[PDB]
Design a protein around this ligand. Structure first.
Ligand SMILES: CSc1ccccc1CC(=O)N1CCC[C@](O)(C(N)=O)C1
Ligand SMILES: [Zn+2]
Length: 139
């Protein structure tokens, strides 16, 4: 679990979105596993606007943050699950690191701010859904 709070927006993994998220929907994209809903309070997370490939992520299954090198956002094949059929998930970045299903939503940050959230994993790898291209999150 976990979300990004920026301005009047809440960013979560689409497969973990609540009824409230869907009732206050701004934008969603199944291919990116992202959903953005509106909030009544002001969010203070800073979104990074950069091409960093190093950062730190929060891993709830270890209660620890880990430093990682990660790939550039791209289309990566993701195994079928209870939420989606087998497909290419876009805007995904992989890193060598520990992750478990309940880890989705953990933030990845670089020195410039929030980069994305944990969205996939398996076999000593962890995948992050990028949010750096969503320029509208700041306006
Ligand atoms: C951190 S998630 C994880 C980690 C280790 C092992 C397995 C997983 C599960 C995982 O990859 N998904 C199942 C739920 C849907 C999913 O989030 C997606 N974006 O399609 C993919
Ligand atoms: Zn950066």
């Amino acid at each position: 679990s976990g979300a990004i709070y920026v301005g009047n927006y809440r960013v979560v993994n689409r497969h973990l979105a609540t009824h409230n998220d869907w009732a206050n929907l701004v934008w969603e994209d199944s291919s990116r596993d992202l959903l953005v809903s509106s909030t009544t309070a002001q969010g203070c997370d800073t979104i990074a606007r950069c091409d960093c490939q190093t950062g730190v992520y929060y891993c709830s299954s270890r209660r620890k943050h880990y430093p990682v090198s990660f790939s550039k956002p791209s289309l990566i094949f993701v195994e079928a699950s209870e939420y989606y059929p087998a497909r290419y998930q876009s805007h995904l970045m992989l890193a060598v690191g520990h992750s478990e299903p309940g880890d989705c939503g953990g933030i990845l940050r670089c020195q410039h701010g929030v980069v994305g959230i944990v969205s996939t994993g398996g076999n000593g790898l962890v995948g992050f859904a990028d949010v750096r291209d969503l320029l509208w999150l700041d306006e």
